[PDB]
Design a protein around this ligand. Structure first.
Ligand code: CLA
Ligand code: CLA
Ligand code: CLA
Ligand code: CLA
Ligand code: CLA
Ligand code: CLA
Ligand code: CLA
Ligand code: CLA
Ligand SMILES: CCCCCCCCCCCCCCCC(=O)OC[C@H](COP(=O)(O)OC[C@@H](O)CO)OC(=O)CCCCCCCCCCCCCCC
Ligand SMILES: CC1=C(C/C=C(\C)CCC[C@H](C)CCC[C@H](C)CCCC(C)C)C(=O)c2ccccc2C1=O
Ligand code: SF4
Ligand code: SF4
Ligand code: SF4
Lengths: 31, 33, 80, 91, 60, 39, 740, 143, 148
C-alpha cells in the first residue's frame, strides 16, 4: 500500500522545521 | 508514487535553483571587503 | 609575511645576506663570534620565502631560519 | 625619460585609454528615453536579483511541471516496454 | 679542549650528535661557540666542520 | 697493467663479472639438473 | 680559406683515467663522500661543455663520440645480418614469403624457455621478428646466407674502422676549432658527397642488382637458380634479356636519348601487384633523380674558389619591417653553440622519422612488407616513437642553448631577441589554442559517450547523426586520386592506393586499399592537433622562460637543471627548463600513444584483412567507424577486445609478450612512487635504516642519500615511459602476430 | 650619508619594448625604480627578457618587483662593476628609498645597524608547540 | 621602417604596439563599440550589447538543442534557452558589480561604467537588451523569407 500525498507533505513540513533549526545551529556556530 | 509531480519540481530546484542561489550568495560573501 | 629569525650560532660569514634575492638580510656588529658580526633580518616584509639564505648557511644546524607565514603580494612574488 | 614623480604618474605607470573615447551623443533621445524607463526598476541590484530569481525559478518549475510534458520529454512519458528483465529470474 | 683531541658532540640538533670529531682550534676571546671540530663525514649540506660550546663537547 | 686492473676493480666491472658468474652458475645448474622444485 | 688543420698527439692513450672515476669533472674527481656522487658521475659523463669551456676540446670530444656511436651502430647492423645468416629461416622464407613467418632469433633450451622457439614455418623454430629485415634483404637481391655473412663481416670491419677513427681523431690527429666551423664546406660535402653520391651509388645497386634479381623472383624463379649479381654485372646480354635497353649500353645516356632507358627507369606509381611493394624501377629512377638534385645542391656554398654563397651574408640580408635586424647573429650562434645545432637537427630528424612512418605504411617500398602486418605495425610505431623522443630532445637542447650559450650582446633586436620580448603573447595565445582544442576535440567524445549512455544516438557526433566530415582531407584524397589524368600525366598510377581506387591483394591478404575518412577520423585528427599543440606549449614555454620570468627574474643563474627556487613565491617547484622537458615527455607519450592507437585500430578495421570473392573481410570488421567516436568504444572495442591475444598468450610462443605486458604494467606503476613522492621522506627513512646498519657495524663509508629531486623526477619519467611503451609494445606484437 | 632622492629627469636605457614589463599593479599597488651611473654605453640583459642598451651616464629603469631590481643590480655589480640604487614608488607619489638602505651594501657590516630577529640561543633550544597553545604567538620561534 | 613599437613609446610598460593593436581601422573600430563610449551612459551601452548577444546565442540553441528536429517547438525552445542564458548572465553581471566596486590619460574622467552604480545600470541594460534580442530572434525565425 502506497503512502498518501498528505504523508509526504507532513514529512516535508517536519523536514522544513528541522532545516530551520539547522540554520539556527549553523549561525550560532558561526558567531 | 504518490505526489508524482514532486520530482519534476524539486529536482530543478535542488539541482539548478538552489546551487545558483548558493554560489551567488557565497560569491558575494567571500568577496565582501 | 614570513618570519626570519636569527640564532646565536651564526659565525658571521655573510653568505645568507649575499644569497638573498630581495634584500631582507644585512650584517650588523656583534661580539658573539670571531667575525664580530651577525646576520639580521630587518626587512622580512620583502621576504619571498625562497630559503636561499638557509641553503647558504654553513652552521649545523642552521643559524638563519625562515618560517613561512601569511602570504602577501610581495611574499607571493607577484608582478601583477 | 619615462618617469615623472607628480602630474605624470599616469604616463609613468602606463594608465592610458587605448580605445575609449569621450562622447556624450551616441543614441537618439526617444530611444534612450524609452530604454531608461524600460530598465528603471532593474537599476537596483536587489530588485534585479529578485526579478531574475523569481522569473528563473518560476520558469524552471513551470518547465518541470508543465513545459517538459508539452515538449514530450522522455522522463515525462515514462516506460512503455514493461520493464527491463534481470537475471536469476529477478524482477 | 686540546688541539687535535677527540671529542663527542652533545648538541642534539647537530648532524654529528653522539659522534666523535677532532678539535681543530678553540677560540680564546670568549665567543659563544669557541670549539672548532672537524668530522670524517659530511652532513646534508656537504659540510665537515662545526663550532660548539664547551658544554656541547665531551673529551674522549 | 696496474691502471687497467684498477679499472677492472671498479664497482660495475666487478658487478658484471660476479653476476655473470652467479647467473652462469644458476643457468648451468638448471641445465644439468632441469626442473628442481624440491630438495 | 678552407683547409685541413689538426693538432698532433693532443691526448695520451692511457688507462690512468679509466682507474679514476669522475676524472673529467673538477667537482667529481676528488671522489665520493655520499652516494649522490655515484649518480652525478653518470649524469655528467657526456655533458662536455660542463667539463671545460674550450670550444675546441668540446668539438673534438663530440667528433670522436660520434665515431663511437657509428661503430656501435655498425656492430648492431652486422649482428642483424649475422643472425639472418646463422640463426634464421631466411632462405626458406625466400622460397615462400606468404606462408612463412620471418624469424632470426633462437633461444637456448633452459628453464623451459624453449617454448619461445615458435613454429614459424620453413622447418624452423625461433622468435618471430618484426623489424622487416627479410623484406629489405629480398629487395636488395640477397638470396643466400653467404651474402648475409659477407655483409656481417664487412660491417664489423667498418665498425672497427669507426672505432679506430674516433680514437685517432681524439688522441692522434684532432681537428682544430676552425676545421669544425667550416659549415659551408660541411654542407657542400654532406649534400653532394654524402646524400648525393649515396643516392647515386644506391641507384647503381638497384639498377644492377636489385632490379634483375627481383624481376626473376617475381617471375617465379627459384632463388637458388637465379644468377648471382656479378653475373648481371659481367654479362650485359643477361641483363638485356630482362631490360632490352641495356643492349644499347651507356650510349643512350651520353647522347641524351634518355627515353631509351624507360624499361628500367619508370614512373609507374602505385605498387607491384605480385609483391605489394613499390616498383623497384621507380625506386631506381627516384634515387637517380635524388642524387642529381643533391649533387647540384652541394655546390651552393662558397669554399675556396670564389663562387658560392656566404651563409652569413644570406642570413644578414633577410630582415624586414616587422622583424628588426632579422637573422643577424644566427650564423655566430650556429657556429659556436653545439646545443643550438643539436636542437635544430633533433627537431628535423624526429619530424623526418615520423614522416618516414607515414610514407612507408602508405607506399610500402619492400616486397611482401605490406602483408606482413606485424612488420608494418612495428615499423610505423617504432619510427613514430623515435621521432617524438627526438623532438623532445630538440626542446631540451634549445633550452640548454638559451641558458648556457645565449649572449644578449650578440642578439640586439634580432629575431631571437624579439621572440623573447613577446614570449608572454606567444605562450598565452598557445595556451588559449590548447584549451580550445581540448574542449572541441575531447569534449566531442565526452558528448558522444554521454549521449550514447543516455540512449540518444541521434544526438551524437557520428556519420549517421550530426556529421563532422573532414572535407578538406577528402578533397586532397580526390585530387591525389585524379592526378595521373591531368596534373601528373606521365605517372601511370597514383603514389598510393590509400587515395582511392582498387584493393592491392597479395596472397589473399590486403596489402593496401583506400583509407576513407569520416567523422571518427575528423575527431581523432583534432585529438592529434590538440596533443601536439600542448606538447609544443610545454617545450616552447620551457625554452622562452629558461633564463627569466616574472616569478624568477634570475633563473639563468640557477642553470638549466635545478629542482626549484624554494617554497616561497607561493612555491616554485619545476620552474627549470629541464622540468619542462620532464613534463613534455609525458605529453609526447600521450600524443604518440593516441597516434599509434589510431594507426593500429584503423588499419585493422579498414585496411588489413583477407580477400574473398565477395570482397574484403577486415580483421576487426569495420568497427572503427562505428565506435571510435566514443571513449567507451576505444576502451571496449580496441583495448579490451584486442588485448585478448596477449592475455591468452601463456603456453604459446607468444607468452613472452604476456609476461612483458605484466612486467611493463609493473614498471609503469613503479614509476608513480618516484613521481608522486619527495626525497625528504626517503632521506628520513634512510636515516632509520642507517641507524640499523650502524648498530650492527655495517654502515657504509659512502654515506647513503636519497636521490636528488631532479633524479627522482628523471627516474620517474624514465620508468613511466618504459612501462607504458613496453605495455603497448607487447600488446601490439602479440595481437598482430596472432591475428595477422 | 643621507638617502638620495629619485631624480625623475634621468633618461632610461635604449629598449624596444616587451610584453614582460609593468602591469596594472604599478598603477594601483606599487612599482620600483632602479637608478645607476654607467661608465659607457653597452648592452645588458633585461630581467623581464630581451637585450637593452644602457646609456652613458645616469640611467633609470622602472620595474614591477623588488626582486627584478635586485637581479638587475646583481648583474650591474658583477658584470659591469657598477653600483645602483633601488626605490619603491607608490600610486600617491610617495617614493621610498630601499637599497642600499644605509648607503653601505648589506653584506658589509656597518655600524649603526641593530639586529632584528636575533635569538640568543641555538635553534635546538626552542620550546615545544604545546607550550604556545592559546597564546596567540606565531610559533615556538616567536617566543 | 619598423611597424612594431613600444606602447605609447614607453619600452617598459608590458605591451607592444603592433598593426593588430594600432591600425587606424582596428583602433577606429574598437573606439566606436558601445564598450568604449566612456561618456555614454552604461545603461544604454548595456542595452546595445545585450541586444547583440541575446540575439546571437539563440542560433546554436535553435539548430543544435535537443528539440531541434521538432518543427515549431525547435524555435521556441531555442529562444527560451537563450533567455535562460541571458538571465544567468544578468545575475553574473550583477554579482560582479556588487563585488568589483567596493587617473587615465589618452586627462580623462574615469568611466561611469567602472563604478558600482554604473555597473548596475549596465546589468539592467544587458537584461532588457538581451531579452529583447531573444524575442526579436524568435520574431525573425517567424518572419524571414529564406529562413529554414
Ligand atoms: C558535518 C558537516 C559540517 C559541520 C557540522 C560544519 C560546521 C561548521 N562549519 Mg564546516 N563545512 C562543511 C561541513 C560542515 N561544517 C563542508 C562539506 C565544507 C566545504 C568543504 C565546509 C566548509 C566551511 C567553511 C568555509 C566554514 C565552515 C564553518 C563552520 C561553522 C559554521 C557553519 C555555518 O553554518 O555558518 C553559517 C554562515 C553563513 C551561512 C554565512 C557565512 C558563510 C560561511 C563562511 C561559509 C559556509 C559554511 C557552510 C558550513 C558551508 C557548507 C558546505 C556544504 C557543501 C555542506 C561550523 C563549526 C565556518 C566557520 O566560521 O569556521 C569555524 C566557515 O567559515 N565550514
Ligand atoms: C540526506 C538525506 C537525503 C538525500 C541524499 C536525498 C536525495 C534525493 N532526494 Mg529525498 N528527502 C529526504 C532526504 C534526502 N533525499 C527526507 C528526509 C525527505 C522527507 C522530507 C526527502 C523528500 C524528498 C522529495 C519529496 C523528493 C526528494 C528527491 C530527492 C532526489 C533529488 C534531490 C531533491 O530534489 O531533494 C528535495 C528534497 C527536499 C527539498 C527536502 C529534503 C531535504 C533534505 C532533508 C536535506 C538534507 C541535507 C543533508 C542532511 C545535509 C546536506 C535525491 C535522490 C526528489 C526525487 O525523489 O526525485 C526523483 C523529490 O521529489 N526527496
Ligand atoms: C539537476 C540539474 C539539471 C537539470 C534539472 C537540467 C535540465 C535541463 N538540461 Mg541539463 N545540465 C546540468 C544540470 C541540469 N540540467 C549540468 C550540471 C550540466 C553541465 C554538466 C548540464 C548540461 C546541459 C546541456 C549542454 C544542455 C542541457 C539541457 C537541459 C534541458 C533538457 C530538457 C529539454 O529538452 O529542454 C529543452 C529546453 C527548453 C524547453 C527551454 C528551457 C529554458 C529554461 C526553462 C530557462 C530557465 C531560466 C533560467 C534557469 C534562469 C536562471 C535564473 C537563476 C536560477 C540563475 C533541461 C532544461 C539542454 C538544453 O535544452 O538546455 C538549454 C542542453 O543543450 N544541460
Ligand atoms: C661463468 C659462469 C659459468 C659456469 C660456472 C659454467 C660451467 C660449465 N660450463 Mg658453461 N658457459 C658460460 C658460463 C658458465 N659455464 C657462458 C657465459 C657461456 C657462453 C654462452 C658458456 C658456454 C658453455 C659451453 C658451450 C659448454 C659449457 C660447458 C660447461 C661445463 C664444463 C666447463 C660447466 C658445467 C660445457 C658442457 O656443457 O659440459 C661438458 C660445454 O660444452 N659452457
Ligand atoms: C623469491 C622468489 C623465488 C623463489 C623462492 C624461487 C624458487 C625457485 N625457482 Mg623461480 N623465479 C623467480 C622467483 C623465485 N623462484 C622470478 C622473479 C623469476 C623470473 C626471473 C623466476 C623464474 C624461474 C624459472 C624460469 C625457473 C625457476 C626455478 C626455481 C627453482 C630453482 C631451484 C634451483 O635452481 O636449485 C638449485 C640450487 C641452488 C642453485 C643452490 C645453490 C647451491 C650452491 C651452488 C652451493 C626454485 C624452486 C626453476 C625450476 O625448475 O622451477 C621449479 C626454473 O626453471 N624460477
Ligand atoms: C646488438 C647486437 C647483438 C645482440 C643484441 C645479439 C644477441 C644475441 N646473440 Mg648475436 N652477434 C652479434 C650481435 C648481437 N647479438 C654480432 C656482431 C655477432 C658476430 C660476432 C654475433 C654472433 C653471435 C653468435 C655466434 C651467437 C650469438 C647468440 C646471441 C644470443 C645470446 C648471446 C649470449 O647469451 O651471450 C653470452 C654472454 C657472454 C657474456 C658470453 C660471451 C662469450 C663469447 C665467446 C665472448 C643473443 C640473442 C648466440 C645464439 O643466438 O644462440 C643460438 C650465438 O651462438 N651471436
Ligand atoms: C664527401 C665527403 C663526406 C662524407 C661522405 C661525410 C659523411 C659523414 N660525416 Mg661529414 N665532413 C666532411 C665530408 C664528408 N662527410 C668535411 C669536408 C667536413 C669538414 C667541413 C666534415 C665534418 C664532419 C663532422 C664534424 C661530422 C661529420 C659526420 C659525418 C657522418 C654523418 C652521420 C652519417 O650519416 O653516417 C653515415 C655513415 C656511413 C654511411 C658509414 C660509412 C662512412 C664512411 C666510411 C666515411 C666516408 C666519409 C669520410 C669523410 C671519407 C674519408 C675517408 C678517411 C679515411 C679520410 C658521415 C659519416 C659526423 C660524424 O658522424 O662523424 C664521426 C660528425 O660529427 N662530418
Ligand atoms: C585525463 C587526465 C588529464 C586531464 C583531463 C588534464 C587537463 C588538462 N591538462 Mg593536464 N596532465 C595530465 C593529465 C590530464 N590533464 C598528467 C597526468 C600530467 C602530468 C605530466 C599533466 C600535465 C599537464 C601540463 C604540463 C599541461 C597540462 C595542460 C592541460 C589542459 C589542456 C587544455 C585543455 O584541454 O582544456 C580543456 C579541458 C579538458 C579537455 C578537460 C576535460 C573537460 C571536460 C570535457 C569539460 C567538462 C565541463 C563540465 C561538464 C562543466 C562543469 C560542471 C560541473 C562543475 C558540475 C587541461 C586543463 C596544459 C595546459 O594547461 O595548457 C592550456 C599544460 O601545459 N597538463
Ligand atoms: C597552418 C599553421 C597555422 C596557421 C595559423 C597559425 C598562426 C600562428 C602564429 C601567429 C602569426 C604571428 C605573426 C607574427 C610573426 C611576424 O613577425 O610576422 C611578420 C612576417 C614577416 O615579417 P618581415 O617581412 O619583417 O620578415 C622578414 C624576415 O626575413 C625575417 O623574419 O610576416 C607575417 O605576417 C608572417 C605570417 C604570419 C602567418 C603565418 C602563417 C604560417 C602559415
Ligand atoms: C623510492 C624513492 C627513493 C628511494 C630510492 C633510492 C635511494 C634509489 C635506490 C637505488 C639502488 C637500489 C641503491 C643501491 C645501489 C647499489 C649500487 C647496490 C649494490 C648492491 C648489489 C646487489 C648491486 C628516493 O630516493 C626518491 C627521491 C626523490 C623522489 C622520489 C624518490 C623515491 O620515490
Ligand atoms: S627566504 Fe629568500 S627572500 Fe627570505 S630572507 Fe631568505 S633568501 Fe631572503
Ligand atoms: S646566518 Fe648562517 S649564512 Fe648568515 S651570516 Fe650567520 S652563519 Fe653565515
Ligand atoms: S617541494 Fe621540493 S621542489 Fe617544491 S619548493 Fe620544496 S624542495 Fe623545491
Amino acid at each position: 500500500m502506497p503512502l498518501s500525498d498528505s504523508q509526504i507533505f507532513i514529512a516535508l513540513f517536519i523536514a522544513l522545521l528541522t532545516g530551520i533549526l539547522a540554520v539556527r545551529l549553523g549561525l550560532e556556530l558561526y558567531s | 508514487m504518490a505526489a508524482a509531480y514532486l520530482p519534476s519540481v524539486l529536482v530543478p530546484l535542488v539541482g539548478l535553483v538552489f546551487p545558483a542561489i548558493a554560489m551567488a550568495s557565497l560569491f558575494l560573501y567571500i568577496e565582501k571587503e | 609575511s614570513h618570519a626570519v629569525k636569527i640564532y646565536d650560532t651564526c659565525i658571521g660569514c655573510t653568505q645568507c645576506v649575499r644569497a638573498c634575492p630581495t634584500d631582507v638580510l644585512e650584517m650588523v656588529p656583534w661580539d658573539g663570534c670571531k667575525a664580530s658580526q651577525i646576520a639580521s633580518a630587518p626587512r622580512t616584509e620583502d621576504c619571498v620565502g625562497c630559503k636561499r639564505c638557509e641553503s647558504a648557511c654553513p652552521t649545523d644546524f642552521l643559524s638563519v631560519r625562515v618560517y613561512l607565514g601569511s602570504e602577501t603580494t610581495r611574499s607571493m612574488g607577484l608582478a601583477y | 625619460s619615462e618617469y615623472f614623480d607628480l602630474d605624470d604618474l599616469e604616463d609613468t605607470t602606463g594608465s592610458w585609454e587605448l580605445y575609449g573615447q569621450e562622447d556624450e551623443k551616441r543614441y537618439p533621445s526617444l530611444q534612450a528615453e524609452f530604454f531608461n524607463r524600460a530598465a528603471a526598476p532593474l537599476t537596483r541590484r536587489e530588485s534585479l536579483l529578485a526579478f531574475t530569481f523569481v522569473g528563473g525559478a518560476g520558469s524552471l518549475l513551470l518547465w518541470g511541471a508543465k513545459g517538459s510534458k508539452d515538449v514530450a520529454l522522455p522522463i515525462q512519458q515514462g516506460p512503455k516496454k514493461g520493464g527491463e528483465k534481470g537475471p536469476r529470474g529477478k524482477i | 679542549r686540546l688541539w687535535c683531541v677527540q671529542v663527542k658532540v652533545l648538541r642534539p640538533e647537530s648532524y654529528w650528535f653522539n659522534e666523535v670529531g677532532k678539535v681543530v682550534s678553540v677560540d680564546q676571546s670568549g665567543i659563544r661557540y669557541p670549539v672548532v671540530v672537524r668530522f670524517p663525514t659530511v652532513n646534508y649540506a656537504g659540510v665537515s666542520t662545526n663550532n660548539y660550546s664547551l658544554e656541547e663537547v665531551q673529551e674522549v | 697493467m696496474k691502471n687497467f686492473t684498477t679499472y677492472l676493480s671498479t664497482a660495475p666491472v666487478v658487478a658484471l663479472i660476479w653476476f655473470t658468474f652467479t647467473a652462469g652458475l644458476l643457468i648451468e645448474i638448471n641445465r644439468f639438473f632441469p626442473d628442481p622444485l624440491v630438495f | 680559406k678552407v683547409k685541413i688543420v689538426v693538432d698532433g698527439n693532443p691526448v695520451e692513450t692511457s688507462f690512468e683515467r679509466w682507474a679514476k672515476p669522475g676524472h673529467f669533472s673538477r667537482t667529481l674527481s676528488k671522489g665520493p663522500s655520499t652516494t649522490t656522487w655515484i649518480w652525478n658521475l653518470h649524469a655528467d659523463a657526456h655533458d662536455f661543455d660542463s667539463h671545460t669551456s674550450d670550444l675546441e676540446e668540446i668539438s673534438r670530444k663530440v667528433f670522436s663520440a660520434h665515431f663511437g656511436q657509428l661503430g656501435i651502430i655498425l656492430i648492431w647492423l652486422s649482428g642483424m645480418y649475422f643472425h639472418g645468416a646463422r640463426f634464421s629461416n631466411y632462405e626458406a622464407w625466400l622460397s615462400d614469403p606468404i606462408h612463412i613467418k620471418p624469424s632470426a632469433q633462437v633461444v637456448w633450451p633452459v628453464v623451459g624457455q624453449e617454448i619461445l622457439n615458435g613454429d614459424v614455418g620453413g622447418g624452423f623454430q625461433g622468435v618471430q621478428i618484426t623489424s622487416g629485415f627479410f623484406q629489405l634483404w629480398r629487395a636488395s637481391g640477397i638470396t643466400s646466407e653467404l651474402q648475409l655473412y659477407s655483409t656481417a663481416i664487412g660491417g664489423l670491419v667498418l665498425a672497427a674502422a669507426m672505432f679506430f677513427a674516433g680514437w685517432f681523431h681524439y688522441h692522434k690527429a684532432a681537428p682544430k676549432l676552425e676545421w669544425f666551423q667550416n659549415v659551408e664546406s660541411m654542407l657542400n660535402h654532406h649534400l653532394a658527397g654524402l646524400l648525393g653520391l649515396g643516392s647515386l651509388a644506391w641507384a647503381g645497386h638497384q639498377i644492377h642488382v636489385s632490379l634483375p634479381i627481383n624481376k626473376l623472383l617475381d617471375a617465379g624463379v627459384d632463388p637458388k637458380e637465379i644468377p648471382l649479381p656479378h653475373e648481371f654485372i659481367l654479362n650485359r646480354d643477361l641483363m638485356a634479356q630482362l631490360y632490352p635497353s641495356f643492349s644499347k649500353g651507356l650510349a643512350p645516356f651520353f647522347t641524351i636519348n634518355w627515353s631509351e632507358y624507360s624499361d628500367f627507369l619508370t614512373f609507374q606509381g602505385g605498387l607491384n601487384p605480385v609483391t605489394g611493394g613499390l616498383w623497384l624501377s621507380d625506386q631506381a629512377h627516384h634515387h637517380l633523380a635524388i642524387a642529381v638534385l643533391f649533387l647540384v645542391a652541394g655546390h651552393q656554398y662558397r669554399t675556396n674558389w670564389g663562387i658560392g654563397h656566404s651563409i652569413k651574408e644570406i642570413l644578414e640580408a633577410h630582415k624586414g619591417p616587422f622583424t628588426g635586424e632579422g637573422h643577424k647573429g644566427l650564423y655566430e650562434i650556429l657556429t659556436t653553440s653545439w646545443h643550438a645545432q643539436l636542437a635544430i637537427n633533433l627537431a628535423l630528424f624526429g619530424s623526418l622519422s615520423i614522416i618516414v612512418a607515414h610514407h612507408m605504411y602508405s607506399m610500402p617500398p619492400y616486397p611482401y612488407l605490406a602483408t606482413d602486418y606485424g612488420t608494418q605495425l612495428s615499423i610505423f610505431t617504432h619510427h613514430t616513437w623515435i621521432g617524438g623522443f627526438c623532438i623532445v630532445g630538440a626542446g631540451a637542447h634549445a633550452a640548454i642553448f638559451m641558458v648556457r650559450d645565449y649572449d644578449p650582446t650578440n642578439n640586439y633586436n634580432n629575431l631571437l631577441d624579439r621572440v623573447i620580448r613577446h614570449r608572454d603573447a606567444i605562450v598565452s595565445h598557445l595556451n588559449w589554442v590548447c584549451i580550445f582544442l581540448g574542449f572541441h576535440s575531447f569534449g566531442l567524445y565526452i558528448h558522444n559517450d554521454t549521449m550514447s549512455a543516455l540512449g540518444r544516438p541521434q544526438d551524437m557526433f557520428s556519420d549517421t547523426a550530426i556529421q563532422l566530415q573532414p572535407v578538406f582531407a577528402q578533397w586532397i584524397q580526390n585530387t591525389h586520386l585524379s592526378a595521373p589524368q591531368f596534373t601528373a600525366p606521365n605517372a601511370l598510377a597514383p603514389t598510393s592506393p590509400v587515395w582511392g581506387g582498387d584493393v592491392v591483394a597479395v596472397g589473399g591478404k590486403v596489402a593496401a586499399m583506400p583509407i576513407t575518412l569520416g567523422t571518427a577520423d575528423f575527431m581523432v585528427h583534432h585529438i592529434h592537433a590538440f596533443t601536439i599543440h600542448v606538447t609544443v606549449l610545454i617545450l616552447l614555454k620551457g625554452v622562452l622562460y629558461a633564463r627569466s620570468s616574472r616569478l624568477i627574474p634570475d633563473k639563468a643563474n640557477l642553470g638549466f637543471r635545478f629542482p626549484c627556487d624554494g617554497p616561497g613565491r607561493g612555491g616554485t617547484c619545476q620552474v627549470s627548463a629541464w622540468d619542462h622537458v620532464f613534463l613534455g615527455l609525458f605529453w609526447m607519450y600521450n600524443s604518440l600513444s593516441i597516434a599509434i592507437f589510431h594507426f593500429s585500430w584503423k588499419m585493422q578495421s579498414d585496411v588489413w584483412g583477407t580477400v574473398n570473392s565477395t570482397g574484403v573481410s577486415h580483421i576487426t570488421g569495420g568497427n572503427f567507424s562505428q565506435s571510435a567516436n566514443t571513449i567507451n568504444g576505444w576502451l571496449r572495442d580496441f583495448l579490451w577486445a584486442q588485448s585478448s591475444q596477449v592475455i591468452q598468450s601463456y603456453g604459446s610462443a607468444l607468452s613472452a609478450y604476456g609476461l612483458i605486458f605484466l612486467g611493463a604494467h609493473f614498471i609503469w606503476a613503479f614509476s608513480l612512487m618516484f613521481l608522486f613522492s619527495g626525497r625528504g621522506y626517503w632521506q628520513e627513512l634512510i636515516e632509520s635504516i642507517v641507524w640499523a646498519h650502524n648498530k650492527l657495524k655495517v654502515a657504509p663509508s659512502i654515506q647513503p642519500r636519497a636521490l636528488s629531486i631532479t633524479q627522482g623526477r628523471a627516474v620517474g619519467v624514465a620508468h613511466y615511459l618504459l612501462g607504458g611503451i613496453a605495455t603497448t609494445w607487447s600488446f601490439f606484437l602479440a595481437r598482430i602476430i596472432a591475428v595477422g | 650619508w643621507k638617502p638620495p632622492t629619485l631624480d625623475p629627469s634621468t633618461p632610461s636605457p635604449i629598449f624596444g619594448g616587451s610584453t614582460g614589463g609593468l602591469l596594472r599593479k604599478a598603477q594601483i599597488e606599487e612599482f620600483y625604480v632602479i637608478t645607476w651611473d654607467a661608465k659607457k654605453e653597452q648592452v645588458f640583459e633585461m630581467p623581464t627578457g630581451g637585450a637593452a642598451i644602457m646609456r652613458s651616464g645616469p640611467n633609470l629603469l622602472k620595474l614591477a618587483r623588488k626582486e627584478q631590481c635586485l637581479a638587475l643590480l646583481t648583474q650591474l655589480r658583477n658584470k659591469f662593476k657598477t653600483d645602483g640604487q633601488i626605490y619603491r614608488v607608490f600610486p600617491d607619489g610617495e617614493v621610498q628609498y630601499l637599497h642600499p638602505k644605509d648607503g653601505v651594501y648589506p653584506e658589509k657590516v656597518n655600524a649603526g645597524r641593530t639586529a632584528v630577529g636575533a635569538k640568543d640561543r641555538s635553534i635546538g633550544k626552542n620550546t615545544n608547540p604545546v607550550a604556545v597553545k592559546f597564546t596567540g604567538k606565531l610559533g615556538t620561534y616567536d617566543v | 621602417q619598423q611597424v612594431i613599437q613600444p606602447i605609447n613609446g614607453d619600452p617598459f610598460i608590458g605591451m607592444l604596439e603592433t598593426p593588430v593593436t594600432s591600425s587606424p581601422l582596428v583602433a577606429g573600430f574598437l573606439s566606436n563599440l558601445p564598450a568604449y563610449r566612456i561618456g555614454v551612459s552604461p545603461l544604454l551601452r548595456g542595452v546595445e550589447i545585450g541586444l547583440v548577444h541575446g540575439f546571437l546565442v539563440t542560433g546554436p540553441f535553435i539548430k543544435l538543442g535537443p528539440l531541434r528536429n521538432i518543427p515549431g517547438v525547435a524555435e521556441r525552445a531555442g529562444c527560451l534557452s537563450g533567455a535562460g542564458l541571458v538571465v544567468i548572465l544578468a545575475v553574473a553581471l550583477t554579482i560582479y558589480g556588487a563585488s568589483a566596486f567596493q587617473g587615465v590619460k589618452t586627462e580623462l574622467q574615469r568611466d561611469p561604467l567602472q563604478t558600482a552604480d554604473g555597473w548596475q545600470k549596465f546589468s539592467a541594460g544587458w537584461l532588457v537588451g538581451g531579452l529583447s534580442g531573444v524575442a526579436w530572434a524568435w520574431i525573425l525565425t517567424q518572419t524571414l523569407p529564406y529562413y529554414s
